[PDB]
Amino acid sequence: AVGIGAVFLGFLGAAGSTMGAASMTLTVQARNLLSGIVTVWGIKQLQARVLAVERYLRDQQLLGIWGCSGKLICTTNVPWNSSWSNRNLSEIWDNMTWLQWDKEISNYTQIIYGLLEESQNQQEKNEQDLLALD
Amino acid sequence: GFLGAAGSTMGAASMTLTVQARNLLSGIVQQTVWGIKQLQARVLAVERYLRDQQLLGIWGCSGKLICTTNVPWNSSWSNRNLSEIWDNMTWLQWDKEISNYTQIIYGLLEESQNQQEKNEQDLLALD
């Protein structure tokens, strides 16, 4: 005794679309990270809930250590090194999905993390206290 | 006070909520069969607090406790005049007058958060 009245986007519907266009549905995933509840069985229920808590806190900590916490997408001051890819700025944004780019760069992750941490610490916070005094 | 503004009008208890806010900024501070229950209790507390902090953090309202946003209020949800609301109604009555349209309001805040604030910010960054 029901009808269907679809309005908004699907969960991971934009995954087959292009990156610069599929960047506008980022809300729905973080909307749907910590729900589903909305003897042995309750044991594995609590197991699953703990795992979800752990991954969400891990990624929020990685957000918080960077200077891109709380908000969504942002900027930085680390200039790009062309040793990783060498595209000419249209082939990525208009001609490439996300799984393709993920398989292209899945060896350089930790260096990028460390260098963002480096520029976030250095010349941003000691520099702040330099600016906090004449 | 701990839930001290109960039997008041919404417009009446509209100024001293900051003392409520500092007093509601606690709960973990100032610290077998039963231990299973204790574990489950801690799990419930953690899940509720993280639910609230997630729903704050998605919107632009995750700093201060009151804020403004860019959504025009549609007259399909309620139709009562402004002074009629702020001087003649409690919180619970307003709750039962709005507790069917809540998810749509959430989704509209979400789309207003994503659109025209970050990709627009990204175009504003390019000089």
Partner: antibody, heavy 134, light 112 residues
Framework: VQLVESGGGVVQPGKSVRLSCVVS????????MYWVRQAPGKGLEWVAA????????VYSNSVQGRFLVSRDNVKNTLYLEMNSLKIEDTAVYRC????????????????????????????WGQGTTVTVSS | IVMTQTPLSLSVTPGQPASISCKSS???????????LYWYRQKPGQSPQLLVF???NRFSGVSDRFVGSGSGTDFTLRISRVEAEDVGFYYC?????????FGGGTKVDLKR
Amino acid sequence: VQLVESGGGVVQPGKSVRLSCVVSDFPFSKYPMYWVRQAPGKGLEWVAAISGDAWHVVYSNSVQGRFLVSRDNVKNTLYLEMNSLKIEDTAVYRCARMFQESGPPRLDRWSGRNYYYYSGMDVWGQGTTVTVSS
Amino acid sequence: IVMTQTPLSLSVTPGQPASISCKSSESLRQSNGKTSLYWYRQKPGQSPQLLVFEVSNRFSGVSDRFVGSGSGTDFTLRISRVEAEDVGFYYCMQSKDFPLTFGGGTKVDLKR
């Protein structure tokens, strides 16, 4: 409560009409309405049903490609149309009301999809009959 | 989704209990937490009138002889104190899924 079923008549095949149904004594913007069908000397049959806010509509297995129904919330008046008729479509046509008051739609946070809810009826009016003849 | 009446029809006499079934073809346990089986009766040359909703819940302004019964396997009815006013056709009706379906027909009269 007041609820009439106007619109008797007799036609040959291949026509187009307009039907009316006057209501009173309820807040018309809240309720759903149905259309049932009773063949002569027979039992009952469901045809069509319009949504509460007049945006969703379902038909029977027969006339998907024939009919059209619409709601006037201002005049509190139902409008039905039956086109491309057949002589064996002669029955009793009645305009009756769901018992249970429905409410607002529901929006899931999982790929939106606004859902509606229906249930059966309580009140039948008198009725009418158009015999499609030759 | 189909639905059958059980049995067809019966002539009855006063001073007797009554029970009229309506066999399902599925189980219609709603996510709201109940089952969508309604009864409503008509009289000849007249309009139908609502008998019982909520499986087992008498309609407002109805004498106490009318209640409901049954679960998602199959259903029955429950009428005591047979009276001549209780004649006509009794229909069971599905209100779970589109399209709806109806009970066939129960002819009810006295005995000669």
